[PDB]
mmCIF file with all atom_site columns, all heavy atoms in Angstrom:
data_model
loop_
_atom_site.group_PDB
_atom_site.id
_atom_site.type_symbol
_atom_site.label_atom_id
_atom_site.label_alt_id
_atom_site.label_comp_id
_atom_site.label_asym_id
_atom_site.label_entity_id
_atom_site.label_seq_id
_atom_site.pdbx_PDB_ins_code
_atom_site.Cartn_x
_atom_site.Cartn_y
_atom_site.Cartn_z
_atom_site.occupancy
_atom_site.B_iso_or_equiv
_atom_site.pdbx_formal_charge
_atom_site.auth_seq_id
_atom_site.auth_comp_id
_atom_site.auth_asym_id
_atom_site.auth_atom_id
_atom_site.pdbx_PDB_model_num
ATOM 1   N N   . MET B 1 697 ? -159.508 -4.599 78.569 1.00 0.00 ? 1070 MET B N   1
ATOM 2   C CA  . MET B 1 697 ? -158.186 -3.988 78.711 1.00 0.00 ? 1070 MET B CA  1
ATOM 3   C C   . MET B 1 697 ? -157.451 -4.685 79.854 1.00 0.00 ? 1070 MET B C   1
ATOM 4   O O   . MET B 1 697 ? -157.646 -4.350 81.025 1.00 0.00 ? 1070 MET B O   1
ATOM 5   C CB  . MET B 1 697 ? -158.308 -2.486 78.967 1.00 0.00 ? 1070 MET B CB  1
ATOM 6   C CG  . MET B 1 697 ? -158.830 -1.682 77.783 1.00 0.00 ? 1070 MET B CG  1
ATOM 7   S SD  . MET B 1 697 ? -157.693 -1.697 76.381 1.00 0.00 ? 1070 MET B SD  1
ATOM 8   C CE  . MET B 1 697 ? -158.699 -0.939 75.104 1.00 0.00 ? 1070 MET B CE  1
ATOM 9   N N   . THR B 1 698 ? -156.591 -5.649 79.512 1.00 0.00 ? 1071 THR B N   1
ATOM 10  C CA  . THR B 1 698 ? -155.848 -6.369 80.543 1.00 0.00 ? 1071 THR B CA  1
ATOM 11  C C   . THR B 1 698 ? -154.869 -5.462 81.280 1.00 0.00 ? 1071 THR B C   1
ATOM 12  O O   . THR B 1 698 ? -154.521 -5.737 82.434 1.00 0.00 ? 1071 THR B O   1
ATOM 13  C CB  . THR B 1 698 ? -155.103 -7.558 79.931 1.00 0.00 ? 1071 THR B CB  1
ATOM 14  O OG1 . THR B 1 698 ? -154.315 -8.201 80.940 1.00 0.00 ? 1071 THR B OG1 1
ATOM 15  C CG2 . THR B 1 698 ? -154.194 -7.098 78.800 1.00 0.00 ? 1071 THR B CG2 1
ATOM 16  N N   . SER B 1 699 ? -154.418 -4.380 80.639 1.00 0.00 ? 1072 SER B N   1
ATOM 17  C CA  . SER B 1 699 ? -153.463 -3.472 81.267 1.00 0.00 ? 1072 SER B CA  1
ATOM 18  C C   . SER B 1 699 ? -154.093 -2.626 82.366 1.00 0.00 ? 1072 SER B C   1
ATOM 19  O O   . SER B 1 699 ? -153.363 -2.033 83.168 1.00 0.00 ? 1072 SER B O   1
ATOM 20  C CB  . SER B 1 699 ? -152.839 -2.554 80.214 1.00 0.00 ? 1072 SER B CB  1
ATOM 21  O OG  . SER B 1 699 ? -153.811 -1.667 79.682 1.00 0.00 ? 1072 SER B OG  1
ATOM 22  N N   . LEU B 1 700 ? -155.420 -2.543 82.415 1.00 0.00 ? 1073 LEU B N   1
ATOM 23  C CA  . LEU B 1 700 ? -156.107 -1.754 83.427 1.00 0.00 ? 1073 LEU B CA  1
ATOM 24  C C   . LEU B 1 700 ? -156.253 -2.488 84.758 1.00 0.00 ? 1073 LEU B C   1
ATOM 25  O O   . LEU B 1 700 ? -157.061 -2.072 85.598 1.00 0.00 ? 1073 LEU B O   1
ATOM 26  C CB  . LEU B 1 700 ? -157.481 -1.312 82.913 1.00 0.00 ? 1073 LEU B CB  1
ATOM 27  C CG  . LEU B 1 700 ? -157.510 -0.160 81.899 1.00 0.00 ? 1073 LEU B CG  1
ATOM 28  C CD1 . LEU B 1 700 ? -158.936 0.304  81.641 1.00 0.00 ? 1073 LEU B CD1 1
ATOM 29  C CD2 . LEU B 1 700 ? -156.651 1.003  82.367 1.00 0.00 ? 1073 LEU B CD2 1
ATOM 30  N N   . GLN B 1 701 ? -155.494 -3.562 84.966 1.00 0.00 ? 1074 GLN B N   1
ATOM 31  C CA  . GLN B 1 701 ? -155.496 -4.226 86.261 1.00 0.00 ? 1074 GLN B CA  1
ATOM 32  C C   . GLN B 1 701 ? -154.923 -3.297 87.324 1.00 0.00 ? 1074 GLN B C   1
ATOM 33  O O   . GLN B 1 701 ? -153.934 -2.594 87.093 1.00 0.00 ? 1074 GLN B O   1
ATOM 34  C CB  . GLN B 1 701 ? -154.694 -5.524 86.196 1.00 0.00 ? 1074 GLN B CB  1
ATOM 35  C CG  . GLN B 1 701 ? -153.234 -5.338 85.845 1.00 0.00 ? 1074 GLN B CG  1
ATOM 36  C CD  . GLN B 1 701 ? -152.489 -6.650 85.822 1.00 0.00 ? 1074 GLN B CD  1
ATOM 37  O OE1 . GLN B 1 701 ? -153.089 -7.716 85.959 1.00 0.00 ? 1074 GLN B OE1 1
ATOM 38  N NE2 . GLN B 1 701 ? -151.174 -6.583 85.651 1.00 0.00 ? 1074 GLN B NE2 1
ATOM 39  N N   . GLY B 1 702 ? -155.558 -3.289 88.487 1.00 0.00 ? 1075 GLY B N   1
ATOM 40  C CA  . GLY B 1 702 ? -155.175 -2.377 89.560 1.00 0.00 ? 1075 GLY B CA  1
ATOM 41  C C   . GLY B 1 702 ? -155.803 -1.015 89.445 1.00 0.00 ? 1075 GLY B C   1
ATOM 42  O O   . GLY B 1 702 ? -156.323 -0.486 90.432 1.00 0.00 ? 1075 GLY B O   1
ATOM 43  N N   . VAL B 1 703 ? -155.777 -0.430 88.247 1.00 0.00 ? 1076 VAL B N   1
ATOM 44  C CA  . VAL B 1 703 ? -156.382 0.881  88.035 1.00 0.00 ? 1076 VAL B CA  1
ATOM 45  C C   . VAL B 1 703 ? -157.884 0.818  88.277 1.00 0.00 ? 1076 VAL B C   1
ATOM 46  O O   . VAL B 1 703 ? -158.452 1.658  88.985 1.00 0.00 ? 1076 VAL B O   1
ATOM 47  C CB  . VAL B 1 703 ? -156.065 1.393  86.618 1.00 0.00 ? 1076 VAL B CB  1
ATOM 48  C CG1 . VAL B 1 703 ? -156.771 2.715  86.364 1.00 0.00 ? 1076 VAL B CG1 1
ATOM 49  C CG2 . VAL B 1 703 ? -154.554 1.513  86.405 1.00 0.00 ? 1076 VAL B CG2 1
ATOM 50  N N   . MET B 1 704 ? -158.551 -0.179 87.687 1.00 0.00 ? 1077 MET B N   1
ATOM 51  C CA  . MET B 1 704 ? -160.001 -0.285 87.817 1.00 0.00 ? 1077 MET B CA  1
ATOM 52  C C   . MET B 1 704 ? -160.419 -0.821 89.182 1.00 0.00 ? 1077 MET B C   1
ATOM 53  O O   . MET B 1 704 ? -161.473 -0.434 89.695 1.00 0.00 ? 1077 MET B O   1
ATOM 54  C CB  . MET B 1 704 ? -160.573 -1.170 86.702 1.00 0.00 ? 1077 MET B CB  1
ATOM 55  C CG  . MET B 1 704 ? -160.353 -0.635 85.290 1.00 0.00 ? 1077 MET B CG  1
ATOM 56  S SD  . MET B 1 704 ? -160.890 1.075  85.096 1.00 0.00 ? 1077 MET B SD  1
ATOM 57  C CE  . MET B 1 704 ? -162.643 0.951  85.437 1.00 0.00 ? 1077 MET B CE  1
ATOM 58  N N   . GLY B 1 705 ? -159.620 -1.711 89.777 1.00 0.00 ? 1078 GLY B N   1
ATOM 59  C CA  . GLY B 1 705 ? -159.887 -2.127 91.146 1.00 0.00 ? 1078 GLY B CA  1
ATOM 60  C C   . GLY B 1 705 ? -159.963 -0.956 92.109 1.00 0.00 ? 1078 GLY B C   1
ATOM 61  O O   . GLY B 1 705 ? -160.866 -0.885 92.945 1.00 0.00 ? 1078 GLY B O   1
ATOM 62  N N   . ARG B 1 706 ? -159.020 -0.017 91.998 1.00 0.00 ? 1079 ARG B N   1
ATOM 63  C CA  . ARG B 1 706 ? -159.065 1.189  92.823 1.00 0.00 ? 1079 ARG B CA  1
ATOM 64  C C   . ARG B 1 706 ? -160.334 1.993  92.563 1.00 0.00 ? 1079 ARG B C   1
ATOM 65  O O   . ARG B 1 706 ? -160.991 2.453  93.504 1.00 0.00 ? 1079 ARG B O   1
ATOM 66  C CB  . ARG B 1 706 ? -157.827 2.051  92.564 1.00 0.00 ? 1079 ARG B CB  1
ATOM 67  C CG  . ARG B 1 706 ? -157.880 3.428  93.211 1.00 0.00 ? 1079 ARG B CG  1
ATOM 68  C CD  . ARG B 1 706 ? -156.643 4.244  92.883 1.00 0.00 ? 1079 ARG B CD  1
ATOM 69  N NE  . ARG B 1 706 ? -156.551 4.533  91.456 1.00 0.00 ? 1079 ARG B NE  1
ATOM 70  C CZ  . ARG B 1 706 ? -155.484 5.068  90.872 1.00 0.00 ? 1079 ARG B CZ  1
ATOM 71  N NH1 . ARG B 1 706 ? -154.414 5.370  91.594 1.00 0.00 ? 1079 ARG B NH1 1
ATOM 72  N NH2 . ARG B 1 706 ? -155.485 5.298  89.567 1.00 0.00 ? 1079 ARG B NH2 1
ATOM 73  N N   . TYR B 1 707 ? -160.696 2.174  91.289 1.00 0.00 ? 1080 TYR B N   1
ATOM 74  C CA  . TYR B 1 707 ? -161.881 2.963  90.955 1.00 0.00 ? 1080 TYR B CA  1
ATOM 75  C C   . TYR B 1 707 ? -163.155 2.269  91.423 1.00 0.00 ? 1080 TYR B C   1
ATOM 76  O O   . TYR B 1 707 ? -164.100 2.930  91.872 1.00 0.00 ? 1080 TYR B O   1
ATOM 77  C CB  . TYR B 1 707 ? -161.934 3.227  89.447 1.00 0.00 ? 1080 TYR B CB  1
ATOM 78  C CG  . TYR B 1 707 ? -163.103 4.088  89.010 1.00 0.00 ? 1080 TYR B CG  1
ATOM 79  C CD1 . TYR B 1 707 ? -163.088 5.462  89.210 1.00 0.00 ? 1080 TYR B CD1 1
ATOM 80  C CD2 . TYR B 1 707 ? -164.217 3.531  88.393 1.00 0.00 ? 1080 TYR B CD2 1
ATOM 81  C CE1 . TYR B 1 707 ? -164.150 6.257  88.816 1.00 0.00 ? 1080 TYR B CE1 1
ATOM 82  C CE2 . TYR B 1 707 ? -165.288 4.322  87.994 1.00 0.00 ? 1080 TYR B CE2 1
ATOM 83  C CZ  . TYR B 1 707 ? -165.244 5.685  88.210 1.00 0.00 ? 1080 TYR B CZ  1
ATOM 84  O OH  . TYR B 1 707 ? -166.295 6.486  87.820 1.00 0.00 ? 1080 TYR B OH  1
ATOM 85  N N   . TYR B 1 708 ? -163.199 0.937  91.324 1.00 0.00 ? 1081 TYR B N   1
ATOM 86  C CA  . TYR B 1 708 ? -164.379 0.196  91.763 1.00 0.00 ? 1081 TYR B CA  1
ATOM 87  C C   . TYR B 1 708 ? -164.479 0.166  93.283 1.00 0.00 ? 1081 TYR B C   1
ATOM 88  O O   . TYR B 1 708 ? -165.578 0.267  93.839 1.00 0.00 ? 1081 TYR B O   1
ATOM 89  C CB  . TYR B 1 708 ? -164.349 -1.225 91.189 1.00 0.00 ? 1081 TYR B CB  1
ATOM 90  C CG  . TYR B 1 708 ? -164.528 -1.278 89.685 1.00 0.00 ? 1081 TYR B CG  1
ATOM 91  C CD1 . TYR B 1 708 ? -163.951 -2.289 88.926 1.00 0.00 ? 1081 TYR B CD1 1
ATOM 92  C CD2 . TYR B 1 708 ? -165.277 -0.315 89.027 1.00 0.00 ? 1081 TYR B CD2 1
ATOM 93  C CE1 . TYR B 1 708 ? -164.114 -2.332 87.551 1.00 0.00 ? 1081 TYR B CE1 1
ATOM 94  C CE2 . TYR B 1 708 ? -165.445 -0.350 87.658 1.00 0.00 ? 1081 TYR B CE2 1
ATOM 95  C CZ  . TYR B 1 708 ? -164.862 -1.358 86.925 1.00 0.00 ? 1081 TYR B CZ  1
ATOM 96  O OH  . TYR B 1 708 ? -165.035 -1.387 85.560 1.00 0.00 ? 1081 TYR B OH  1
ATOM 97  N N   . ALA B 1 709 ? -163.340 0.031  93.971 1.00 0.00 ? 1082 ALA B N   1
ATOM 98  C CA  . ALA B 1 709 ? -163.345 0.066  95.430 1.00 0.00 ? 1082 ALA B CA  1
ATOM 99  C C   . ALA B 1 709 ? -163.908 1.383  95.952 1.00 0.00 ? 1082 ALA B C   1
ATOM 100 O O   . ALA B 1 709 ? -164.741 1.392  96.865 1.00 0.00 ? 1082 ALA B O   1
ATOM 101 C CB  . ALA B 1 709 ? -161.931 -0.161 95.966 1.00 0.00 ? 1082 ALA B CB  1
#
Side-chain angles (χ1 to χ4, degrees):
Chain B
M1070 292 294 171
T1071 176
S1072 67
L1073 284 189
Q1074 61 179 6
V1076 176
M1077 298 308 298
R1079 171 182 64 190
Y1080 182 77
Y1081 292 150

